[PDB]
Amino acid sequence: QPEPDMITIFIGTWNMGNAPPPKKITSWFLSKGQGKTRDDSADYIPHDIYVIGTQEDPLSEKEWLEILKHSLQEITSVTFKTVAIHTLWNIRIVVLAKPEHENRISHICTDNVKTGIANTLGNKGAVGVSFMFNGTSLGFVNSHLTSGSEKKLRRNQNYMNILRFLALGDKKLSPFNITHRFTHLFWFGDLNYRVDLPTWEAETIIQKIKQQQYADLLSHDQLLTERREQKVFLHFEEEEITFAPTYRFERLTRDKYAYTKQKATGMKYNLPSWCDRVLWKSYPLVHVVCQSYGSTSDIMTSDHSPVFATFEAGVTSQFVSKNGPGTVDSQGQIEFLRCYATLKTKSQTKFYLEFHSSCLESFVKSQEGENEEGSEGELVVKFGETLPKLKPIISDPEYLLDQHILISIKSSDSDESYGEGCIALRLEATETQLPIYTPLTHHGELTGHFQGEIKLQTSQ
């Protein structure tokens, strides 16, 4: 039975509004309703992995798992295995996988982050799950960010706290946050970004939604505008939105948006908004294709509608050779030529690099680079031809061309990372000098760039 080179992944996010679900929720897992929906001809085909994020979830873990498993069994006639479940307050993540994957999944991690301080600590934050699927690392984040139209900056701060402090994936990747630890990272939830239009325009917005004319609303969506301005979710993707705003509905229908200020809302307006979102970030040149992104129309117990997204994702096999794992494969090497880091720092410490990759026995430290002053007042750190030659554990091009090198540039004075990025080994040529490039981030904000050339030698 061959190992897969692709899987499909279902991502669901639903703010349940503290109400139990209705008896039938299958439309969620079938990607049926509004937006980019799944073809009816696929309804019996199970996804490989289902990741369910809830917010304001009133159920016990046992109660929700029974509903989820019975839903999937009805759709697919498959009894899914529980990979992980983790709950912080009323924020929950469930991961389910086809039984045939049970011995493909390992290194399961869970964690949570509580956002805010004093007043604002006690219900917002994030839960996450990571694991290895054969040779591929997968991370999943469900976050419930700060509410309210005038708190976009708070949401952005919540985002940065979550990516800094959520401890998932390989703890040996010490310089790297969750935005660099996984082949594929999915981040979803009630992100709570709003359509920024004046309150007086509520009925006009409702009109536009009834006409299915979303363009003049999406152009004011705070998540799209903050992402365009590089304030949040730098280097993440989101599918185009083609479904109506998923908040705030009157319960038990979808005919009415409930936007007016009430004592129950803290006298705040809740103009119709795309609160409920799915974004992803995959390593460079890894296959990932969104095959659905939409909302259900028939699940009406909450003031939010459920959101679904599905993906094709590239995966690799747990490779063994005569040599690696447990030795190098002398026939393989990775060389870096003419490399330099450009950093936004004012600091004047010397810097060194760390190269991390599961194609190495352990990470590799470089010599210090040569600092030069750049023409527009930046720091340029030159490595020239001084970088260590990296010795992969396996030389087979079928393995090595699918790998990635994580790079951290660290201060010699403090050993703190000033920037992290990732280089794909999926090159146009071997034994050939080729340009490489990554942006560098720290705490998920842009701090610089790394560029140079690579020369990859495989056994072929």
Ligand SMILES: Cc1ncc(CNc2cncc(F)c2)s1
């Ligand atoms: C990484 C990014 N590149 C462009 C972005 C903005 N995308 C957008 C879509 N629709 C309506 C808008 F106002 C903006 S985010």
